[PDB]
Write a protein that binds this ligand. Structure first.
Ligand SMILES: CC(=O)Nc1cc(Nc2ccccn2)c2cccc(O)c2n1
Length: 124
């Protein structure tokens, strides 16, 4: 079945709220959330509902925009680079599990190119 989702709070992890992390929630995430290809990434992969029983045998660092959202809302991150790593992990997983030109990869590559032009400039 499905593994536990990644943690969205951790009381012994130091937390911070920088200007660039506010921008990742308020601006970067909340617009990517609205893209037409955003739905498969708005929650952890449900390997049971999707009949992908091999997903979590291949992917061992799962990540998804729904986890990132709760992490941003809970001030989980020390800095913006930690949150950007989570985004890249989400995109990289999708390219590892699937193959060039799959419908899901096209969705991810569309989000990823949008993600890059949106983080091109972060606040100060
Ligand atoms: C062969 C295959 O179904 N691959 C998939 C399917 C996903 N979500 C879905 C969900 C519903 C229908 C089809 N697809 C998916 C999601 C996130 C990351 C991934 O790597 C994914 N890979």
């Amino acid at each position: 079945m499905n593994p536990p989702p990644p943690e969205t709070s951790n009381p012994n992890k130091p937390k911070r709220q920088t200007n660039q992390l506010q921008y990742l929630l308020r601006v970067v995430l909340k617009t990517l959330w609205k893209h037409q290809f955003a739905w498969p990434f708005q929650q952890p992969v449900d390997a049971v509902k999707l009949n992908l029983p091999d997903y979590y045998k291949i992917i061992k660092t799962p990540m998804d925009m729904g986890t990132i959202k709760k992490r941003l809302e809970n001030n989980y991150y020390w800095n913006a680079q930690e949150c950007i790593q989570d985004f890249n992990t989400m995109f990289t997983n999708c390219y590892i599990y699937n193959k060039p030109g799959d419908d899901i990869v096209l969705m991810a590559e569309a989000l990823e190119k949008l993600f890059l032009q949106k983080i091109n400039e972060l606040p100060t």
